[PDB]
Symmetry: C3
Subunit: 362 residues, 3 copies
C-alpha cells in the first residue's frame, strides 16, 4: 500500500516538476512565451486541484478487505500510472531536460497533457473499480450450510474474490446471526408412519416461546413505566428498571437459545440507549425477540478476519453461469451459487383505457 | 438555487465569449491562423455539447431535499466553478482583452482548456456527489422508536444529513406505515407468576384477525365473480361489486386497526385499478391484509416536510463507528445507529472435486 | 449492433489515421516540428489506451435486453459519435488532406482534441446510461396480478422500458416463483354470517403442511446421517441417501403444490450439491420448504423472452408520478405503480446528552 502512496505523490509532483525545472535550470536560455503559457498554468493549477479532490474522494481511504490474491484491476491501474509517469519522465529527460528545450510553450503543453492523462487515468480507475459492476449481470444464491438462511443478490462483473467481499458485506446485516445452539425405503416407510414426535416438539417450542415472549413484553412494559423524563442518570435508571425485567429476559433468552449473545452489561447499555432516545418497550424488545443479524452483536462474534474463499476456479476470474464457491468460517459456510440474469425480450402492447368494459354476469 | 443557474449560464457562455470577442472587437488587428484554430473550434463545439448533455442528465433537476445545513460538497463545487470561471475571466481581461492579444491560436487554446476544465469539474461533481458513496463503508441500524420496525442498510461516505435523507428515502418503502392505534425483583417475580393475560389476548387477536381475513377473502372472491370482461365502466363495476364486500372489508379494517388508512373512495379507486388491470381478488387484498409501507397511502400521511435531524455531532460531518442520530417526527422517531463494516481477510483454499469421497457408515 | 461496432472501430482508427496520413502522403512537403509533437504522440497513445480500456470495461458487452422501442440515450450517443467523427473526417479532408497542410503540429493537436472528445463522449455515455438513474427519484410498487406478491423499489430517471427491464431483473430474485396451482348487500350479510369454511380449510392446510414438513425434516436428517466424509461418489451417495427421503419429499411437494418445480434429477443434483459442499439437512431443505424465487428453478420456467410491456404512455418517456404499466406474461402480470419520492425538509435540533434526566415516578 506504500507503493500506491509513492505513485500518488510522484504523479502529483511530476507536473509541478515539469513546469518548475526549466525556470530553475536554464532561465536565461529559455525562450519567453506569451499569455498562452500562463493560461495553461491556470489550467494546470485547477486540473491538479480537481485531481487532488477526486483522489481524496475515492482513493485516499483504507482498504476494506484483504484479498487472497492480487486485486487485478487495481494492479492494472497501478501499472498504468507507473508506466505513464515513467514514460513522461523518460521523454522529459531525454528530449527536454538533457536537450535543454527552449520552446517553453511545448513544455507547458506537455505538462497540460500529463495532467489530462492523470485525470483520465482517475476516470478509468472509477470505471474499472466502481462503474463496471453497477449493471447487474448475475444472481447469487447465498445459503448458510448450517441452517439454510438464504438470500439472493444481483451482482455485476466482478471477480470471485470481490464478489466474496461483497457477499460478506451483505452477510453481516442480511442473514440472521449464526447460532450453533439451534430395505432402506421400507425402513423409511416404517419410520414415517410412526409418531410424529418432531411436529409436537416444534409446537411445544413455539407455544413456550410465545408464552415467555408474553411474559417478557409485560415485564418490559411494567419496567418502563417505572421511570419518567425530567435526578437520576440514564445508566442509573436503566439499572433501576432492569431488576423488574431481568428474570423474564433471562427466561426468554434461555428458551430461544440466545444466552451468550446478550450479557447483563449489554442489556444495561441497550436499556440506557432506549430510555435515552425515548424508545418504547417494543423498540427495546426488537433486539431480543428475533435473532437479528451478526453486526448487531459484539465484535468478538463477527470474526471477519477468519473467512476462507473456497473455489474450484482461480478467484481472480469473473463470475459466469454455474460458479459455486464457499465462504467458509470455523463455524459454518456460505455456499454461493451464480446464475446468469436472463436475456429479456420485451414487446409493447397498447391498451385503450376506454376499452375496459364490464358486464354483471359471471 | 438561482446562484447555481447563474454559474451554469455563465460557465456555458464564457467559452463562447472567449472565442467571439476577438473577432468582434479587434478583427483587422487579429492575426490569421491556420486549420488548427478551426479544428479547435470543432472541439469546443462538441465538448460544449457534451458538457450541456451531462449537466442536463445529472444536474438540471429539482432538489430532492432541504438540508438543515449547507450541502458541503455542492457548495465546494459551486465555489470551484465560481473561482475557476472568475479566474479565467480575470486572466482573459488583464492579458487578452486589455492587452489586445494578436495570437488568436492562443486564445482558442485558452478556450479549449476552459471547456476541458469545465468537463473535469463536471466529472469531479459526479465523483463527489454520486461516486463517493457507492462503496459501502457503514451499516446503519434504523429502528422506529415506537414499534421497533428495524432495517439495516449499507451506506458509503456521506455526511449525517445526506445519510438522513437517504434513510428517509428508504423509510417510505421499507418500514410498515406508522400506526398509533397499535423489593422490585420480588414484585416482578410475583407478577411473572400470575396469569399470562397478554399471551391469551394475543392468541385471541390472531385468531379473530384470521377469521375476519377469511371472511374478507371469501367476500372479495364472491365480489369479483360478479363481473366479467366485455356495457359498464370500471368505476361503475367497482361501485357495483363493492356492495358485496364492504361489510367484510370494514370488519377486517376494524380488527386490524387500519380504519383511517382506507377511505371508501380509496377502496373504490383501488377496486377500479384492480379490475382494470385484470388483478385477482388476492392481488386486490394484498394492499389490505398487511400494513404496508408509508408511500402506499395518501400524501397527508407522509408528512415528509416534518422530519427533524437530532444529532450530537454537527450534521455536516461524515459518519463514523458509533454515530447515533434521530430522525424525529411528531408521531415517532427513527433511531439510527452506525457501525463500521469490518475489515475482511479472505484466504484461499483449493479443494479437489475428485476428493469428495463418501462411506455408508454414520 | 453492427453499427455500434463499426462506429467503435472507426472512432478508434480515426486518430491513428489523422496522425499517419501526413507522413505517408506528403512526407518531404511536411514541416518538421519539435518535441511538442512527440509529447502529444505520447498523449495520444496513452489516452487511446484509456479509451480502449474504458470501452472494454463498460461497452464491450452483450445487450442484456431487447427493448420494444429504440434505446433513446444510446441512439443519442451513437448519433453523437457518428456526427463527431464524420465532422472531424470532413474537416480533415477539406482543410488538411486536400489542402496538404504543412503545419504538422496543428494536425497532431487536432488528433489530441479528437481523442479528448472521444474520452468526453465516453464520459457522457457513462453519465447518460449509468449515472443518471443512481439518484432515486421514484418509488415503484410492483404487484403480481395473480397472488399479490408486492415489492417496492427506488428507481431514478429512466424511461418506462428501462424501468421495465430493471423490474424484470429484480423480479427473478425478489418475488416468489409463480404457481398457478395455488339486494346484494343483504346476500353479502347472509353469506358472511354463514359457516367460515375458508378459515378452517386454511387451518387444516397449515396444520398438514407443518406435519409433512416435520416428516420431511426428520427424513432428510436421518438421510444425511447415512453418509460421512472420507469410496463412493457424491452422485452415488446422493442416490443412496435419496431413497430414505424420497417419500417424505414427494408428500411435502404434493401438499405444498410444488410438484413440477422439482424433478427427481433436480433433487438428486441438489443432494449432490449439498453433500459436496458439506451442507446440513436444513440447508438442503431451504430450497424445498418455501416457494423461492423464479431464477432458483429451471430455465424452461423463466420464460424471459415472453414479457410484454403494456403502457398507456409511449414507453420511451421517463417516469412521473402516476405512471402505471403492466409487465404481462402468458401466466400473470406485474402491475407497476409509480409514485414520486417526496420532498424532504429536514430541520436540525440539538439535544444535550447531559440533559437526559430521569425520575422514579410514573
Amino acid at each position: 500500500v506504500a507503493a500506491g502512496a509513492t505513485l500518488a505523490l510522484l504523479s502529483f509532483l511530476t507536473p509541478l516538476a515539469f513546469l518548475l525545472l526549466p525556470p530553475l535550470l536554464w532561465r536565461e536560455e529559455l525562450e519567453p512565451c506569451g499569455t498562452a503559457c500562463e493560461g495553461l498554468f491556470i489550467s494546470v493549477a485547477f486540473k491538479l486541484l480537481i485531481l487532488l479532490l477526486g483522489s481524496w474522494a475515492l482513493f485516499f481511504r483504507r482498504p476494506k478487505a484483504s484479498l487472497p490474491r492480487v486485486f487485478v484491476l487495481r494492479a492494472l491501474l497501478m501499472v498504468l500510472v507507473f508506466l505513464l509517469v515513467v514514460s513522461y519522465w523518460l521523454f522529459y529527460g531525454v528530449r527536454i531536460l538533457d536537450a535543454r528545450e527552449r520552446s517553453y510553450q511545448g513544455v507547458v503543453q506537455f505538462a497540460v497533457s500529463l495532467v489530462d492523462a492523470l485525470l483520465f487515468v482517475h476516470y478509468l480507475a472509477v470505471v474499472l473499480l466502481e462503474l463496471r459492476q453497477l449493471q447487474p449481470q448475475f444472481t447469487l444464491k447465498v445459503v448458510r450450510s448450517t441452517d439454510g438462511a438464504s438470500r439472493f443478490y444481483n451482482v455485476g462483473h466482478l471477480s470471485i474474490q470481490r464478489v466474496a467481499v461483497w457477499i460478506l458485506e451483505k452477510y453481516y446485516h442480511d442473514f440472521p446471526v449464526y447460532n450453533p445452539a439451534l430395505v432402506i425405503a421400507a425402513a423409511a416407510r416404517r419410520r414415517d408412519n410412526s409418531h410424529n414426535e418432531y411436529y409436537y416438539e416444534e409446537a411445544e417450542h413455539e407455544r413456550r416461546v410465545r408464552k415467555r415472549r408474553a411474559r417478557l413484553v409485560v415485564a418490559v412494559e411494567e419496567a418502563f413505566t417505572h421511570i419518567k423524563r425530567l435526578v437520576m442518570d440514564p445508566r442509573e435508571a436503566a439499572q433501576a428498571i432492569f431488576a423488574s425485567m431481568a428474570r423474564a429476559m433471562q427466561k426468554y433468552l434461555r428458551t430461544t437459545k440466545q444466552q451468550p449473545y446478550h450479557t447483563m452489561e449489554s442489556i444495561l447499555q441497550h436499556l440506557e440507549f432506549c430510555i435515552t432516545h425515548d424508545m418504547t418497550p417494543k423498540a427495546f424488545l426488537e433486539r431480543y425477540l428475533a435473532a437479528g443479524p451478526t453486526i448487531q452483536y459484539h465484535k468478538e462474534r463477527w470474526l471477519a478476519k477468519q473467512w476462507t474463499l473456497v473455489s474450484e476456479e482461480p478467484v481472480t476470474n469473473g463470475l459466469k453461469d454455474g460458479i459455486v464457491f464457499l465462504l467458509k468460517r470455523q463455524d459454518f459456510s456460505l455456499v454461493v451459487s451464480t446464475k446468469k440474469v436472463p436475456f429479456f425480450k420485451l414487446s409493447e402492447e397498447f391498451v385503450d383505457p376506454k376499452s375496459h368494459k364490464f358486464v354483471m354476469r359471471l
